Design a binder for these strands. Structure first.
Length: 252
DNA sequence: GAACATGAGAGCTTAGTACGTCT
DNA sequence: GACGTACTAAGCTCTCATGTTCT
């Protein structure tokens, strides 16, 4: 509601959001837009989400919004909370003979002639939006309208990460991160039938070009984040190990 | 040489459009 | 409005290719 709206969730939830296909992502943020982040949820609480509002907010033709809503709804239905793994120690305790379920969604339905979707969260997810207001750094806040406009898995993830690291509330913010921790943050990876990781742009200069730049481009182009740059932070002999990202944000 | 920065693009998937339709 | 259809732009992942520097 309105265009300077903010959504807020526990840091522990970032990875789950990053995993979501763009459409589900979209419906998820809309749902959060509807939430007073500081209070509990009525538990038996239903969220109508309207393609109309999506469209207006994401600057997308309504036709698409209808599609994306319906589809995002399906996908969200399937989606689970991605927890790893001592972070699961937290959750278990927080939430306390019955079982642990990691679905984001308890119930969901599009209304085919009616231009909207309805939705109900599971108790599990609740602690990730009902959120005793300190300590400030347990949380990520972002701008709903930026979140919605992004249209790239990498773009979004980067935007979130940056936001996650937006502590100062004044001019120049920055952070250090390792290439792989980044790739993990961006979901620039896969697996397959063997267990372990498989990174997506194995040789950096190609990664930098096909992911980091394109990404940085679009953020600058579609968001409040005014400047974003990054530099090699530490040696690594010849190879590249850690980047320092800097960024300023428009308070407008 | 082993690491980077660049770029054109192949081949294939997804995000987006215009536009007709019908109370 | 709330689509469905039919098409285009844009996005993804990896590969050839031309060149530069590191330390």
């Amino acid at each position: 509601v309105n265009k300077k709206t903010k959504i807020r969730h526990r840091n522990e939830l970032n990875h789950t959001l990053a995993q979501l296909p763009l459409p589900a992502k979209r419906v998820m943020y809309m749902a959060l837009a509807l939430i007073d982040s500081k209070e509990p949820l009525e538990r038996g609480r239903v969220f109508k989400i309207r393609a109309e509002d999506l469209a207006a907010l994401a600057k997308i033709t309504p036709s698409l919004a209808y599609r994306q809503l319906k589809e995002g709804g399906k996908l969200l239905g399937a989606s689970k909370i991605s927890l790893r793994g001592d972070d699961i120690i937290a959750l278990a305790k927080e939430l306390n003979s019955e079982e642990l379920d990691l679905n984001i969604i308890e119930w969901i339905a599009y209304s085919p002639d009616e231009g909207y979707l309805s939705l109900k969260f599971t108790r599990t997810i609740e602690p990730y939006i009902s959120s005793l207001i300190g300590k400030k750094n347990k949380f990520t806040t972002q701008l709903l309208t930026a979140s919605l406009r992004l249209s790239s898995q990498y773009s979004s993830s980067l935007y979130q990460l940056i936001r996650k690291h937006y502590s100062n509330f004044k001019k120049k913010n920055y952070f250090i991160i390792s290439v792989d921790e980044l790739k993990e943050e961006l979901i620039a990876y896969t697996f397959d039938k063997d267990g372990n990781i498989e990174y997506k742009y194995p040789d950096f200069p190609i990664f930098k070009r096909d992911v980091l730049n394109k990404a940085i481009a679009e953020i600058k182009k579609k968001t409040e984040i005014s400047f974003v740059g990054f530099t090699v932070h530490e040696k690594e002999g010849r190879k590249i190990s850690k980047l320092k990202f800097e960024f300023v944000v428009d308070e407008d």
